[PDB]
Amino acid sequence: SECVLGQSKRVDFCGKGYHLMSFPQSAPHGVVFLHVTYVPAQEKNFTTA
Amino acid sequence: SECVLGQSKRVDFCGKGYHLMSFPQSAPHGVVFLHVTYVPAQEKNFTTA
Ligand SMILES: *[C@@H]1O[C@H](CO)[C@@H](O)[C@H](O)[C@H]1NC(C)=O
Ligand SMILES: *[C@@H]1O[C@H](CO)[C@@H](O)[C@H](O)[C@H]1NC(C)=O
């Protein structure tokens, strides 16, 4: 109800990272989710003020 | 603690729709809530870019 029908702001609830979407799948006495995420890749440090 | 004392961004937690407020009511061996919501009514389709 939280991940599939909306977007979740709870950290590390609908995937590791920043949550985007989700899809449910059926299973033999279970359910399987396919969480989508968003992970920064390349870092370049600077000087701030 | 979440619905009554504030506003919830969790989907389908304090009612079905966009949650606004809540009110608690007592009952024998239980509690009863009155969730207020906000639901769109009339649609109209357009063209977007
Ligand atoms: C960025 O970090 C590296 C080591 O982590 C350092 O050598 C470099 O000076 C840093 N960049 C700046 C602009 O100081
Ligand atoms: C809006 O939807 C109706 C039926 O779904 C369709 O007939 C109509 O063409 C749509 N609006 C526009 C501007 O196409």
From Swiss-Prot, chains A, B:
Glycosylation: residue positions: N45
Cystine crosslinks: C3-C14
Physiological role: Subunit of the fusion protein that is processed upon entry into the host cell. Mediates fusion of the virion and cellular membranes by functioning as a class I viral fusion protein. Contains a viral fusion peptide that is unmasked after S2 cleavage. This cleavage can occur at the cell membrane by host TMPRSS2 or during endocytosis by host CSTL. In either case, this triggers an extensive and irreversible conformational change that leads to fusion of the viral envelope with the cellular cytoplasmic membrane, releasing viral genomic RNA into the host cell cytoplasm.
Protein name according to UniProt: Spike protein S2'
Gene: S
Residues of the full protein shown: 1030 to 1078 of 1273
